[PDB]
RNA sequence: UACCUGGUUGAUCCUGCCAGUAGCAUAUGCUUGUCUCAAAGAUUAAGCCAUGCAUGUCUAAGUACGCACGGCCGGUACAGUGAAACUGCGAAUGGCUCAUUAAAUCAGUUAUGGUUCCUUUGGUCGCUCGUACUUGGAUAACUGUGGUAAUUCU
RNA sequence: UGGUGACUCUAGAUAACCUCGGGCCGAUCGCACGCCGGCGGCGACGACCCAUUCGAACGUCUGCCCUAUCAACUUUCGAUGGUAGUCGCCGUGCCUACCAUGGUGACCACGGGUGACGGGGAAUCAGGGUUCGAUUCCGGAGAGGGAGCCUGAGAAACGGCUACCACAUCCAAGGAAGGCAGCAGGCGCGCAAAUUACCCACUCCCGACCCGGGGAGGUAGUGACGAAAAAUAACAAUACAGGACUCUUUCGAGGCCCUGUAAUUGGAAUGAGUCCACUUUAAAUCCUUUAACGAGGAUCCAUUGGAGGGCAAGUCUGGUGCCAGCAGCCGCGGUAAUUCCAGCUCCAAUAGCGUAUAUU
RNA sequence: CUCUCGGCCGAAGCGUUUACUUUGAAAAAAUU
């Protein structure tokens, strides 16, 4: 007996049909849109959305005045507004089902970086995040799949330690400036 | 097993202790005492997890051996000594007194008391027998056996005991129209007036209890604990007034709190 | 297994002793010797040919004298 | 200069004769601060001598700004000696651990089990 | 994501299987830059085991005459710390395994008004009308004498 | 007197009894010492019995996988019941005597099997289900095989003893010592599994006991079992190429974005690494934090499978000639091979990807 | 659905008894 936790999930489901042109092409398109490493990122997103839709489904079957349906539903809607996928007016349980994969890929950090004019391309944004140039509030974020919340979005900066941000030039600049 | 067990694992430990899942392999096995190990706080958990005074078991020990902690007006040096319901914990160096009373949710709340109130505790009688030359004995839920009590006192009644003497003072009889708390089961920690008790021979007697907010619920008689004559309690009551909040209303409360303090 | 201490080398010796032996097929069906000590008694020194005295342990099978003997090189 | 000490969850243990606290350290440019410096800083904050305070468990956050540790400021040095875990007293040279390994002393024990009487003191 | 595709024929529609497909488990092949977690001699042999280790323990409080110790002040019975040994307690927990075992174990449920229960916790402990301002005999540790090839032997 | 749903309960009175292998009715210690010559305050060990806790141990009810190529089974030696007893901590065929002739069974008894410890659970799944659960929590069982004990509150204990069987070490030939299904490690077995590492710093447990001890446990090491995150480049100027907006009958001409080739350049940005220090920590390591060095493609070079159909991707080139081979299946090969071995090219998955097996 | 004892009410019986449904108290944590 040890003091260790063996709890862990798989965070994606591999598709049933491995080769269908519609699917492959679609996922490729998605990838190209939001600058992702492989199919598995897309699949992760798909899995999460699927989970959400399951949750929403298993609530609608209960009575309108059933407490569980109310409370849990309200929580779920809150969670989906707090990330910035749904809208405050469309905060009813049925609207959850009409969500798309891309609407969750839009709230990824990379995409935010791209949109906010900190980067020039999606790949460029990704790289900027990876190299530790992008911070959120004050915390430096290395992970690009970091889902940006609605309230936290209004301050995504360039991190004081980076060359683009505060100052102190990088390595290449140091090397070139110390030639003669 | 060949004999009695001396160990308890953290996973098998009772939930209302609010222990972790990763700090160690073993929970602190409560020493045999006045309370059943399922429904009690060991002194260690209360001292280091609730109050945070100590950080480790060693630190806890270093307090218990310096003889600062008094449970029911008596110095206990054992770190695993079980303090249960209605139990008075006194630290004199800080000048702080706590009584173990169940929270609304079913856990042991850190409930601070006045030094005036800390002089007495309440006891549910478990059994009354007459033994040796016509001497009747009460036996309370805290294993405290009191010789020569009031002949009016019957089973399932609550008595007030002054801790300095160890003698009974005055009692509340179990009757419809008395304020109660639950000591075990689903409704644990909930407070209300007794509505109606129904008897079942050869089984547990189901007792109905009405809330302050009109929420009627039921329990077993072994789990009920009388407190108040009519409506007003004989002891202080936790910050949550014993009325169990539903989830939605709790959420609402939380939201309100968030709003108010920014 | 690392060799640094005499304690480490003792662990190695122990490992070499209790080991699953790979039985090499050629060795097992014949009978062989390693030389521990070699002595030479020439019949005639001018001939430069004499009697050899190879002393060591028989390892393969039961060594029969009627059979020939081959020295490796 | 650019180092800043803030004190979070602060509590006085009168049953232990100490001042228990959480410490946030801001050091935006530099590395993690050596413990001595932080001890000094805390001393200068709380008016007391640096000799009596102990700090432990400093984990710097990802990115490189905040560092969060636990620190306790005892009343007297004697009280500190009497209450603190002995390895934290060894970091200030107040305690010395025996240089023997576990294995050796196990072996010795097992040897001395075998012989009776005064001969337990001879075998080592 | 309540999903099917190839294969019986000159061609067709069927029954029907075989094959594909996706997981999840053990093994294994090739390959492997970083980082957070993380199973791991179960399966076959509940087969055998070199060596080392895993249960020991003292307070103001049972017994100190080991100069073993610096040390009191000296007729100061016992200043103190204290190896040992007697005593008390622990070793019936933990850890390991899954061989046996099929209403057996086990689970939920009930009983003990049919029993025992270290310790803790509470009660009780001049309720008996009949040398004590202190009882006896040993035995360790210690000294010394030994035996046996050898043992945690005596 | 008092109490339960109910006592042959507790409590009361009377007559007695009370084991010598005997039941309680303190021949014990520590701390401060103080009061009318005599009295005392805290605490430690105790102690018959009550309670209590930790339990245990016996019962009740209902709930298991396969098999009829197991249909009758159980009773002479207890089978089912009655009475009396013995034993047992207690209730009982638990045992003994004496009686009766029962009890179970197609609602599957009994017998046999199980690649059967039981649960909590896991995997898969629309709904229903099917399969797994040796594995860290609870319960059970056994320490080579069986059997019997001592001490103890508690054991039919095995890091106790006593035997016999099976193994097996040292022997001076007389005897002595065994028990890793504890933690390492070894052999053997196999398709199949880690270091004779450091530490009681945590979690806890045991102990006369704040102090001692603990291969319980923690920490490292091995670790592609498995799960989470996530690099292997980004950008600008050029030279083309598209797709657009404005102007021209159209050709066209412009300043509008996007795309690769760049056998073109260009500087910036970084981690892998290398490596002071700090931190972490029982002591370390790792991570995190940070000085310096660290990136131009012959590198700091990405792999495994496949490319007729199923099934995403070549009637490309060379070799082979029903040979070698491939191919889950359908089939490919007998001289133009889209299927073999290569080269080139492309596709799928991507730090993973094949293959065999159990299973959904 | 009701006569008996107590403070219009609580005890006393129920009602042929189930099966069924709903509710109530219990059903260890971890996992889910």
UniProtKB/Swiss-Prot annotation, chain A:
There is a cross-link at residues 92, 138 (Glycyl lysine isopeptide (Lys-Gly) (interchain with G-Cter in SUMO2)). Changing residue 136 to F: In a breast cancer sample; somatic mutation. PROSITE patterns: RIBOSOMAL_S4 (PS00632), S4 (PS50889). The modification N6-acetyllysine is found at residues 65, 115, 154. It comes from the Eukaryota. It is found in: Cytoplasm; Nucleus, Nucleolus. Residues 107-180 form the S4 RNA-binding domain. GO terms for biological process: cytoplasmic translation; positive regulation of cell population proliferation; ribosomal small subunit biogenesis; translation. One of its GO terms (molecular function) is rRNA binding. Its main location: cytoplasm. Residues 161-180 are annotated as: Disordered. GO terms for cellular component: cytoplasm; cytosol; cytosolic ribosome; cytosolic small ribosomal subunit; extracellular exosome; focal adhesion; membrane; nucleolus. InterPro entries: Ribosomal_uS4, Ribosomal_uS4_CS, Ribosomal_uS4_euk/arc, Ribosomal_uS4_N, S4_RNA-bd, S4_RNA-bd_sf. Keywords: Acetylation, Cytoplasm, Isopeptide bond, Nucleus, Phosphoprotein, Ribonucleoprotein, Ribosomal protein, RNA-binding, rRNA-binding, Ubl conjugation. The modification Phosphoserine is found at residues 152, 162. Pfam families: Ribosomal_S4, S4. Belongs to the universal ribosomal protein uS4 family. Component of the small ribosomal subunit. Identified in a IGF2BP1-dependent mRNP granule complex containing untranslated mRNAs. Part of the small subunit (SSU) processome, composed of more than 70 proteins and the RNA chaperone small nucleolar RNA (snoRNA) U3. NCBIfam families: PRK04051.1, uS4_arch. This is Small ribosomal subunit protein uS4.
UniProtKB/Swiss-Prot annotation, chain B:
It is found in: Cytoplasm; Nucleus, Nucleolus. Coiled coil: none annotated. Residues 41-103 form the S4 RNA-binding domain. Its main location: cytoplasm. GO terms for biological process: cytoplasmic translation; positive regulation of cell population proliferation; positive regulation of translation; ribosomal small subunit biogenesis; translation. Keywords: Acetylation, Cytoplasm, Isopeptide bond, Nucleus, Ribonucleoprotein, Ribosomal protein, RNA-binding, rRNA-binding, Ubl conjugation. It comes from the Eukaryota. PROSITE patterns: RIBOSOMAL_S4E, S4. The modification N6-acetyllysine is found at residue 232. GO terms for molecular function: RNA binding; rRNA binding; structural constituent of ribosome. One of its GO terms (cellular component) is focal adhesion. Component of the small ribosomal subunit. Part of the small subunit (SSU) processome, composed of more than 70 proteins and the RNA chaperone small nucleolar RNA (snoRNA) U3. Identified in a IGF2BP1-dependent mRNP granule complex containing untranslated mRNAs. Belongs to the eukaryotic ribosomal protein eS4 family. This is Small ribosomal subunit protein eS4, X isoform. It comes from Homo sapiens (Human). The lineage of its organism: Eukaryota, Metazoa, Chordata, Craniata, Vertebrata.
From Swiss-Prot, chain C:
This is Pre-rRNA-processing protein TSR1 homolog. The chain holds residues 221 to 293 of 804 of the full protein. It is found in: Nucleus, Nucleolus. Belongs to the TRAFAC class translation factor GTPase superfamily. Bms1-like GTPase family. TSR1 subfamily. Disulfide bonds: none annotated. Required during maturation of the 40S ribosomal subunit in the nucleolus. It comes from Homo sapiens (Human).
Curated annotation (Swiss-Prot), chain D:
GO terms for cellular component: cytoplasm; cytosol; cytosolic ribosome; cytosolic small ribosomal subunit; endoplasmic reticulum; membrane; nucleolus; nucleoplasm. Residues 90-124 are annotated as: Disordered. It is found in: Cytoplasm; Nucleus, Nucleolus. GO terms for molecular function: RNA binding; structural constituent of ribosome; translation initiation factor binding. The keyword Nucleus applies. There is a cross-link at residue 35 (Glycyl lysine isopeptide (Lys-Gly) (interchain with G-Cter in SUMO2)). Keywords: Acetylation, Cytoplasm, Diamond-Blackfan anemia, Isopeptide bond, Nucleus, Phosphoprotein, Ribonucleoprotein, Ribosomal protein, Ubl conjugation. Mature tissues, such as adult brain, skeletal muscle, heart, and kidney, express low levels, whereas tissues and organs with significant populations of proliferating cells, such as fetal brain, placenta, bone marrow, and various glandular organs, contain significantly higher levels. Gene3D superfamilies: 3.30.70.3370. The modification Phosphothreonine is found at residue 7. The keyword Electron transport does not apply. Residues 99-117 have a biased composition (Basic residues). One of its GO terms (biological process) is erythrocyte homeostasis. It comes from the Eukaryota. It holds the Pfam family Ribosomal_S24e. Disulfide bonds: none annotated. Signal peptide: none annotated. Component of the small ribosomal subunit. The ribosome is a large ribonucleoprotein complex responsible for the synthesis of proteins in the cell. Required for processing of pre-rRNA and maturation of 40S ribosomal subunits. Part of the small subunit (SSU) processome, first precursor of the small eukaryotic ribosomal subunit. Belongs to the eukaryotic ribosomal protein eS24 family. This is Small ribosomal subunit protein eS24. The gene is RPS24.
